[PDB]
Amino acid sequence: ANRFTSNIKGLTQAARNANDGISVAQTTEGALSEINNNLQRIRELTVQAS
C-alpha cells in the first residue's frame, strides 16, 4: 500500500509539473508571435523601400 500511494502521489505531482510546462510554452509562444508581428512589418517596410 505504501508503494502504491507513493506512486500515486508522484503521478499527481508529475501531472502538475506537465501543466506548468504547458503554461511556460504558451507564454513563450505568445512572445514569439509578438516578435513575428514586428518581423512581418519590417518585411513590408523593406518591400516598400526597395
Place this chain on the structure above:
Amino acid sequence: TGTNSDSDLDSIQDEIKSRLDEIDRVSGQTQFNGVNVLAKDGSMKIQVGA
C-alpha cells in the same frame, strides 16, 4: 525663305533663342517629389514582385 531681310530675321532668331531657353528651363526644373527625371541617364527600378 528669302523674302525676309536681316532685320526681319533677327526677330525669328531671338524667338527661337527664347524657345530654346524655355526648353532648357523645363528640362532642368521638372521634378517629382524631390527627385528629378530629365537630368541624369540613370535608370529607375520599381519593386513589383515582393
